Amino acid sequence: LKVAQTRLDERTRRPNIELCRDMAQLRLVNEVHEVDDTIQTLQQRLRDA
Amino acid sequence: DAYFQEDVPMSTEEQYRIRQVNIYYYLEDDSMSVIEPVVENSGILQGKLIKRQRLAKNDRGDHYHWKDLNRGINITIYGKTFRVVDCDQFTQVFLESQGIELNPPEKMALDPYTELRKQPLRKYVTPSDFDQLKQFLTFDKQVLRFYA
Amino acid sequence: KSQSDVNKKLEQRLEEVQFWKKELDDKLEQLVNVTDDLLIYKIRLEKALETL
């Protein structure tokens, strides 16, 4: 989670005139949202245990 | 930074004390001192509480060392339990250099006696200049007609 | 000719510094891995001392 977040932040610090979406920026967004949503699965399983 | 809380029996309305404390740790001799900075209208004799000494952490005779110091940890010296809540900026860059993560910082609790002694502010917020004179000078000869 | 020679020397310097950065990164990887295994063993010691 931390490495995906810091990569996405330092590559949304990209220049001034050329900030470009691609197939990989959406990949990073999906990965971060997925890990943030799926840590709750493990926390709920811990509560059940 | 530190503080320690004392119960007070005979007090009128307050129920406890909070005494702000700065704890120093001298590196060249591993000696530790405790000083309370002076507050204005507190009647307590304020100043040095503990002389620069080597303070024993154990009944065997082991002394305090800089590895055991962090934030948010109670320190007991001479029957008093100090609560360390914050660290200096030179200490913060020193402990990470040696290999110790400092704890996340907290806040210092306030003495209820001195907080009640704060004087009120002599101030007032000015009124708006939109009156019967201002409305008549701007919206004269303007009416709204509605059929019903 | 002087400009070309300066460029070649700069290229060699860049290659040296890149190699040493790679070696330091690999050493950091191994060190932090051993550190996490040390924390796992510390948690095992804590649970043994608790259950005793």
């Binding site: - | 040696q98 290999g99 | 860049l14 191994q30 040390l38 043994a48």
Partner: protein, 105 residues
């Protein structure tokens, strides 16, 4: 806990080396990217002088090799501490089991 602290100190020294090595990469890439006709190329006032803080190639190589040497030393010490701790746990478990069996009999 003490060995963990020493490993963290070695990690901090390695991080301090990397954070300057990256600045070296950026500076040398700016240096190699220049050509004859580019914008923002300017004379420097009182140039061609060597700074007193400059070190030598042998000292730089010694610094890098010394840091790698220290980190590898700390890694080996932590490894054999791990083996030691595993053996301590095995000792205590077997001793308690034997004592409980004897007491029950």
């Amino acid at each position: 806990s003490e060995q963990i602290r020493m490993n963290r100190s070695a990690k901090y020294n390695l991080e301090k080396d990397l954070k300057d090595k990256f600045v070296a990469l950026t500076i040398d890439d700016i240096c190699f990217s220049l050509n004859n006709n580019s914008p923002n190329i300017r004379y420097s006032e009182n140039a061609v002088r060597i700074e007193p803080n400059s070190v030598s190639l042998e000292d730089w190589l010694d610094f890098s090799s010394t840091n790698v040497e220290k980190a590898d030393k700390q890694r080996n010490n932590s490894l054999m501490l791990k083996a030691l701790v595993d053996r301590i746990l095995s000792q205590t478990a077997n001793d308690l089991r034997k004592q409980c069996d004897v007491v029950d009999t």
